[PDB]
């Protein structure tokens, strides 16, 4: 949570453990590349879990997760999605973002 942290950690990092009123303020430690990330500075002792790009959803990875940037998905070859956000892609019936 961080109510007792005086100092933030920058993107890509997290507090080693929760701050407390008596403990020496914990150092920042890096998120696990490929697994977790923080795209924004924060006062917490947790990173966020990298999302997945599930094939069964017609997705694949476009950019792998980095310590500071959540995974970026895209449609698979021959699938497409109209909306700006795409919980999934459907088979071209065409760009990865358009249907023909």
């Amino acid at each position, epitope marked *: 949570d*961080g*109510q*007792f942290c005086h*100092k*933030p950690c*920058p993107p890509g990092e997290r507090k080693a453990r929760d701050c407390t009123v008596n403990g020496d303020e914990p150092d920042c430690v890096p998120c696990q590349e490929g697994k977790e990330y923080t795209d*924004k500075a924060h006062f917490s002792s947790k990173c966020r879990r990298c999302r997945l790009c599930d094939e069964g959803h017609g997705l694949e990875v476009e950019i792998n997760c980095t310590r500071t940037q959540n995974t970026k998905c895209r449609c698979k070859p021959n699938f497409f999605c109209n909306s700006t956000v795409c919980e999934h892609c459907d088979p071209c019936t065409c760009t990865l973002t358009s249907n023909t």
Partner: antibody, heavy 132, light 111 residues
Framework: QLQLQESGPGLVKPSETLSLTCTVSGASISANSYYGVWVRQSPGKGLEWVGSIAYRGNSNSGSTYYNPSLKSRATVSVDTSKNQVSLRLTSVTAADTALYYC???????????????????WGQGTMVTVSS | QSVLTQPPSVSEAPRQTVTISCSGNSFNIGRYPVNWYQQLPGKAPKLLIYYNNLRFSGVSDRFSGSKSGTSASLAIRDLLSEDEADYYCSTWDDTLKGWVFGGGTKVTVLG
């Protein structure tokens, strides 16, 4: 809801200790936790954060963090029975003349799980002049 | 100078728009979100924008904030006389290991 009110002597002499009080109303600073700060403003000039206390009512203790440029001249503390946070500044000089504000630091949601800190409630400010 | 640089003054006619820049470096804005405070003549600062672009409770949607790289920006559209005030940006600085504020920007609605 929360309201803050600063008070203290308006004139202090150099080498002497400056003492200020910040009185919390509309809530109890010992109910849960309370993060208080002091911020000062030399007349016609900008803002400068002085220091902080992160205070936990149930253990009646807080931890402090100070602006390094104050060279350890600043201390902040809590008097829970008066709902007050205080500032003490030692060895003051002319450069310490300023409007002194107290404020609360709150972790604010962004609506997507993230929080960031801001000074969301401020006192009215008390003016302090340092002169021999 | 403050580690965050703001123009001392911006202005425009009523109903127009002004933009206030706030520039830092890789150890402050480059890493951390920016908050903005509004200080009316003779009053204390109050929270205006937090976390780059979120309006604090009560704040008019005429105020908007953004951040890019090592700079942040506050824009006030459809200006009214009541908007005349000093505006301060603020963030954490890892070189100084503390909270920092820009030097402040006075807004004038040209009369």
């Amino acid at each position: 809801q929360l309201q803050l009110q600063e008070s203290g002597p308006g004139l202090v002499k150099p080498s002497e200790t400056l003492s200020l009080t910040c009185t919390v109303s509309g809530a109890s600073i010992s109910a849960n936790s309370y993060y208080g700060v002091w911020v000062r403003q030399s007349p016609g000039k900008g803002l400068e954060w002085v220091g902080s206390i992160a205070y936990r009512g149930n253990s009646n203790s807080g931890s402090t963090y100070y602006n390094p440029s104050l060279k350890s001249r600043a201390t902040v503390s809590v008097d829970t029975s008066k709902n007050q946070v205080s500032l003490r500044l030692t060895s003051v000089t002319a450069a310490d003349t300023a409007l002194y504000y107290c404020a609360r630091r709150q972790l604010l949601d962004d609506g997507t799980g993230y929080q960031w800190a801001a000074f969301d409630v401020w006192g009215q400010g008390t003016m302090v002049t340092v002169s021999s | 100078q403050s580690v965050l640089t703001q123009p001392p003054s911006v202005s425009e006619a009523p109903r127009q728009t002004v933009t206030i820049s706030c520039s830092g470096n890789s150890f402050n804005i480059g890493r951390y979100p920016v908050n903005w405070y509004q200080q009316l003549p003779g009053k204390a600062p109050k929270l205006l924008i937090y976390y780059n672009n979120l309006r604090f409770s009560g704040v008019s949607d005429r105020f908007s904030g953004s951040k890019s790289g090592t700079s942040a920006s506050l824009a006030i559209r459809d200006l009214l006389s009541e908007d005349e005030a000093d505006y301060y940006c603020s963030t954490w600085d890892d070189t100084l290991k503390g909270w920092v504020f820009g030097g402040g920007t006075k807004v004038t609605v040209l009369g």
